[PDB]
Structures are given as structure tokens and as C-alpha cells.
């Protein structure tokens, strides 16, 4: 006499129909044919369910209150190395960690809703690591810190800089080595229209907007540098991105 409840990422809890005697309802779970099991004081099927590994790790699933977020542990037959933690949220947007044989989190893959990724690996003591972000048509690299992700396009002396502050928030820069004034590639970023203005020589050259929908558009500046002109042009590929950087 179960119940069934949709879970964040198409999964299912059982959730007894009924309580028992002290008010408890009982929670099944089966994550990768592993049955995880349970009780709770809500009858909405939140709550944690346990469950022990054919190689003694222990896997416990937390589900919160309002449905909106699991979040999936697993751990050495001590319960407290931690072999991995996933959490999803109910727009399967989710964080999944990874970690080394101490239990320390050395590799984490942010899926963002839309199905682009962030990657991290070798993460270190220090908060550093390398960093991969992955786009519809494009793969970018970088580097992680503890204060931000730092995505890198290098075209020529020109060097585009997608920065990932730890909220999420993108903000661009460029730099140009050039050594000739007259062709040198300038840029300002306007975190409110989410648009990078590059200028060369005086005159604003292109704005490339960072949507919300981690894509990226190109439009360009007449002759004048002073009206934009045409109409802006979705970035769906790597060499387009450095075409806009030539």
C-alpha cells in the first residue's frame, strides 16, 4: 500500500499510503538498483532513506521538505569518507562531486538547466583547479580558483576571459598585447546588459552579448563606430568566437 512521488531528475520515492502506529511513514528508494529505505514524519515522501552497497559503501538520499532538491551521498563503509555527492534540483540543474581516496572533493561537474556544464578537475587544498565549460557547439578551458573560473580564448595577442564568480555570475574581459596602437583591441563589460564593447583605434568595433542562455550573440558597429548595425549573430562554434577576436 505505497504511494509514488516524482523526485527531482525523474526519480521516484514510495511513500507508504498510511502511518504507522507512531505517525511514521515508510520511504523506499532504488538509485541504480541499490533499494534505499526509510521513515518520516511528513507523508510527502521528503525525508532519508539508507542504504548499504554490495562493497560496503554507504549511500544515503536526503530529499527536502518541498520536493525541490535530493541530494545523493555516497561514502566509505565508515560513513564518513565521502566517495561522492550529487545534488539535483527540481529543474535537474544539479552539483556532483567527486572525491579522492582521503574524501577530499578533487572533481565537480556544475550542469546548469539548459544542459551546459561546467567541469572541474584536480582540484587542490587551495581551492585551484582546471576548468572546462561546456556550451552547445563549443568546449572552453580554463583554470579555478577559490575566488572565480576563468574560461580563456586566445586569438592573435588577444586574449578573451569568460570570469565565473561562485554565485554563478559571468563577467568578461579582454586583453591585447598588440604592440601596434592603431590595430590593439580594447574592451569594456557591462554587467547590466551582460555585453562586452570591444574598441579598436577609437571606435567601438562589436558588442558580444552573454546571454542567459549561456550563449553568445556578435553584432557589429557601422564605420562610425557610433550605431550599431545589421542584426546580432548567435556564436555557435569555437572559430566563430575567435573570428569576432581577430
Known amino acids: 500500500n505505497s504511494v509514488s512521488v516524482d523526485l527531482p531528475g525523474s526519480m521516484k520515492v514510495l511513500v ?25 514524519d511528513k ?7 539508507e542504504g548499504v552497497k554490495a562493497d560496503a559503501s554507504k549511500v544515503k538520499l536526503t530529499i527536502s521538505d518541498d520536493l525541490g532538491q535530493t541530494t545523493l551521498e555516497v561514502f566509505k563503509s565508515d560513513g564518513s569518507t565521502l566517495v561522492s555527492k550529487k545534488v539535483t534540483s527540481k529543474d535537474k540543474s544539479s552539483t556532483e562531486e567527486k572525491a579522492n581516496e582521503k574524501g577530499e572533493v578533487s572533481e565537480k561537474i556544475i550542469t546548469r538547466a539548459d544542459g551546459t556544464r561546467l567541469e572541474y578537475t584536480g582540484i587542490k587544498s587551495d581551492g585551484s583547479g582546471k576548468a572546462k565549460e561546456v556550451l552547445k557547439g ?26 565565473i564568480s561562485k554565485s554563478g555570475e559571468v563577467s568578461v574581459e579582454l586583453n591585447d598585447t598588440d604592440s601596434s596602437a592603431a590595430t590593439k583591441k580594447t574592451a569594456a563589460w557591462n554587467s547590466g546588459t551582460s555585453t562586452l564593447t570591444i574598441t579598436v583605434n577609437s571606435k567601438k568595433t562589436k558588442d558580444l552579448v552573454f546571454t542567459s542562455s549561456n550563449t553568445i550573440t ?3 558597429y557601422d564605420s562610425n563606430g557610433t550605431s550599431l548595425e545589421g542584426s546580432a549573430v548567435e ?6 568566437i575567435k573570428n569576432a577576436l581577430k
Open 235 to 240: 556564436i555557435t562554434k569555437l572559430d566563430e
Open 16 to 40: 507508504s499510503k498510511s502511518s504507522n502506529a507512531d505517525g511514521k511513514y515508510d520511504l523506499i528508494a532504488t538509485v541504480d538498483a541499490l533499494e534505499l529505505s526509510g521513515t518520516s
Open 138 to 163: 563549443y568546449v572552453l578551458e580554463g583554470t579555478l580558483t577559490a575566488e572565480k573560473t576563468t574560461l580563456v580564448v586566445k586569438e592573435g595577442t588577444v586574449t578573451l576571459s569568460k570570469n
Open 218 to 220: 556578435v553584432q557589429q
Open 43 to 49: 507523508n510527502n515522501g521528503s525525508g532519508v532513506l
